[PDB]
Amino acid sequence: GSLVVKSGQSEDRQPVPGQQMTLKIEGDHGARVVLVAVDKGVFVLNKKNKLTQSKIWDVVEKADIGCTPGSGKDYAGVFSDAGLTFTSSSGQQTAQRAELQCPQPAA
Amino acid sequence: TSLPTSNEYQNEKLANELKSLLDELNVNELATGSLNTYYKRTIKISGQKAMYALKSKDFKKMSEAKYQLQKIYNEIDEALKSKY
């Protein structure tokens, strides 16, 4: 969807310790948003193990059942190499898959 | 007696306007008792600046303190409307 967080004050400069400030939040309707503010000084000691949207997709992609950029050796390979199984009443079926992870990256 | 002169008017008007705010200073200062520390910190500082400027009768300091003291007042007025 989309989630943006900008300054409510559509004007002015830098605030002063103790001063209030409007905080605009542009997100999807019906969505719940959890917030958190941290002093940048903390990240100077440690910036690892954070939470990023990019790190999320990186995990989703790793859990993909497809193990080939495309195509295959044969018709039964195209489906399997794309994360699918074909089976017909004529006999044409795909290669039996019985292993969770993708092929061990054999360079 | 007739009338004032060049620096005789503007310098007196600013003094009166600055005094009007200083009168209700204790009013606003005591109004921050329920508000945050920010308002209590800003008004106790902007308070002296208005007093010292008044006795000095310096056009610059009086004006400099007039808006200094006027701003904090308005910030307090708005700080109360969120509380009813």
The DSSP-derived string for B8-43 is HHHHHHHHHHHHHHHHTHHHHHHGGGSS-HHHHHHH
> Domain span at residue A3?
1-62
Region of A30 please: left (phi>0), alpha (psi -120 to 50) or beta: left
Q: How far apart are the first and last CA of chain A?
A: 37
Q: Give contacts of B41 with chain A, Cβ < 8 Å.
A: 18
Taking the C-alpha atoms of residue B27 and residue B31, their distance in angstroms, rounded to an integer, is 6
What are the residues facing B52 on neighbouring strands? none
What are the φ/ψ torsions at residue A49 (nearest 5 degrees)? 65, 30
For residue B75, the SS3 value is: helix
For the purposes of burial, counting CB atoms within 10 Å of the CB of B69, is it exposed (0-12), middle (13-18) or buried (19 or more)?
Answer: buried
Question: B37 and A18: CB-CB below 8 Å?
Answer: yes
Residue A87: phi, psi to the nearest 5?
A: -150, 125
Note whether B58 and B15 are within 8 A (CB).
no
- Mutant choice from A16, A20, A22 vs B, greatest count of B C-beta within 10 A: A20
Q: Note whether B37 contacts A: Cβ–Cβ < 8 A.
A: yes
Question: Is residue B61 helix, strand or coil?
Answer: helix
Q: Which residue of B has its CA nearest to A15?
A: B38
Interchain proximity B37–A19, CB inside 8 Å:
no
CATH number of the domain enclosing A16:
6.20.50.160
∠A24-A27-A31 over CA atoms, to 5°? 125
Residue B10 has a CB neighbour count (10 Å cut-off) of 12
How many angstroms from the chain centroid is the CA of residue A105?
A: 22
Rounded Cα distance, A84 and A68, in Å: 12
How far apart, in Å, do the first and last CA atoms of chain B sit?
Answer: 51
SS3 A26: strand
Report the alpha-carbon distance of residue A77 to residue A94 in Å, rounded: 7
**Helix B6-23 × helix B59-81 angle, to 10°:** 30
The string over A40-58, giving b where at least 16 C-beta atoms fall within 10 Å of a residue's C-beta and e elsewhere, is eeeeeeeeeeeeeeeeeee
Residue A94: how many other CB atoms lie within 10 Å: 18
Domains of chain B: 1-84 (1.20.1270.10)
**Residue partners of B17: CB distance under 8 A and separation at least 6:** B66
Q: How far, rounded to the nearest angstrom, does the alpha carbon of residue A73 sit from its chain's CA centroid?
A: 31
Please report where in the chains the tokens 């941290």 appear, as a residue.
Answer: A38
> Mind telling me how many Å the CA of A28 is from chain B's nearest CA?
27
| B2 in reach of chain A (CB within 8 A) | no
Q: Which residues contact B36 (CB under 8 A, 6 or more apart)?
A: A18, B79
What is the stated resolution of the deposited model, in angstroms? Answer: 3.9
- Determination technique for this PDB entry? X-ray
Q: Which amino acid is at B44?
A: K
Q: How far, in Å, CA of B73 to CA of B24, rounded?
A: 10
Tell me the Cα Rg of chain A: 25
> Cβ of B50: how many Cβ atoms within 10 Å?
22
- CB-CB neighbors (< 8 A) of A22 in chain B: none
